[model samples]
Target: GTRQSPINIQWKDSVYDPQLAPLRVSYDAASCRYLWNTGYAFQVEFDDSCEDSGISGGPLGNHYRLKQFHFHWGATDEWGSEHAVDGHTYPAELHLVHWNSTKYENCKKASVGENGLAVIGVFLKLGAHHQALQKLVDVLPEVRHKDTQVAMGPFDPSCLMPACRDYWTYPGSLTTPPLAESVTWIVQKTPVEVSPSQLSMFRTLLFSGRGEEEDVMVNNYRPLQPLRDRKLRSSFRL
Candidate 1:
């Protein structure tokens, strides 16, 4: 596909679009259901069966329902994030996956078509302990092995978002399998902070099954893809 994701966002080349509106996110804490090990990374799944939680505006044509949120990290602090700012990498990256609820019936169908998905990407830097993230850290032991899952009662994903709404928006695809060219990438300009210990917990997860040999889940990110002819837009000016 010509348009792919996890591109090195060249801030100098990004165009500031005054027409872009502030993103509106409305999430219900009750909608969060399960946290599981996908063998790639741990994902916090949401109950998107209804109009319970979703995001709208900010380069989006319609409302996209909350589906699930996952992370990509490295074995070390040097690199873990998928998307970067001018080739600079972060410790980890969080992907809040959403599907076009207005145009599609479900996430599966929306994932393959244009403007079908809207993923809000947030970078994670090592710093002070992230309070909200500790909830997830406490449960990591439960889903240590692949295919393992545990209930995550009332987890408000909004707490994971950066306070500043300034961001970079572009046309891209999923970094994972199928590599569908359907996502509207909204990457926050400001990165969130999590302690070194928090990130260490993320590394404890495994790609192997319960009885299988342990293969630590790390560096579960795709390498940077070419920008091609796609334009990168920003909500804030330089």
Candidate 2:
């Protein structure tokens, strides 16, 4: 379970829809990006809320939008990981998935080919006051169910970026189903801090039923796939 896997993904540049005013957006894959059964493709929106920091401005520069961010947790205290590093698992993981700005005007027209999107995965560790994370957690109480959207207040999405740029890069399919083979996986080595209560709040999320579902919203992460004949080059190592 600690092994890495090779992902052969293909994605094309996203297309923009100017018809939609104010909240213009785009996406490479609809519904399948997350485990939710939502009918539309996940779109990345221009978020002035995200500042230039961490890895946000690296490859794409300032073209990609902030879109939305979510978390992955576990029921107990053990397992929950979208990408496992040398067999180590964290309490939770936060992914700030972004599309390639150099490619598409909007994500809606982006092709799920080989270079469609760029996703930055930030690992979350249990700790004390995480001022950056509070913005998202505070809104959790209002949107605890799946497919919930809220007008997030002024918050810098880039604050969640890991301090270290060291990452595991490879070509892989979207972890979610439809499994579009067009994602460039960038798993950061450094992890951000989150209070115990913050992590507990994530457990309250539900995938299917309303508030009555017994299954805790924890463990919503996919296990790391096999690095089958794939090359995983690290920034530090390279």
Cα lDDT of all candidates, in order? 0.93, 0.53
> For residues 1-238, what per-residue lDDT tens digits would candidate 2 score against the true structure?
2223222221121122222222112332222221231212112233423323213433333345444555666785565656666567788777666655556554443436446655667788877668877766676655555565555445555567665655556666665554666666666778888788877777666564455553446567666665655545554432
Against the true structure, candidate 1 reaches a TM-score of 0.98
Evaluated at residue 92, the lDDT of candidate 1 is: 98
Q: What are the per-residue Cα lDDT tens digits for candidate 1 across 1-238? A: 8998899999666998999977899999998899999989999999897775889888998789999999999999999999989989999999999999888888999999888999999999998899999999999999999999999889888899889879999999999989999999999989999999999999999999998988999999999998888989999997
lDDT for predicted candidate 1 compared with the true structure: 0.93
Q: Model 2, 143: alpha-carbon shift in Å?
A: 1.0
TM-score of 2: 0.71
| Model 2 RMSD vs true structure | 9.9
Provide backbone clash counts, one per model: 0, 31
- Report residue 67 deviation for candidate 1 (angstroms): 0.5
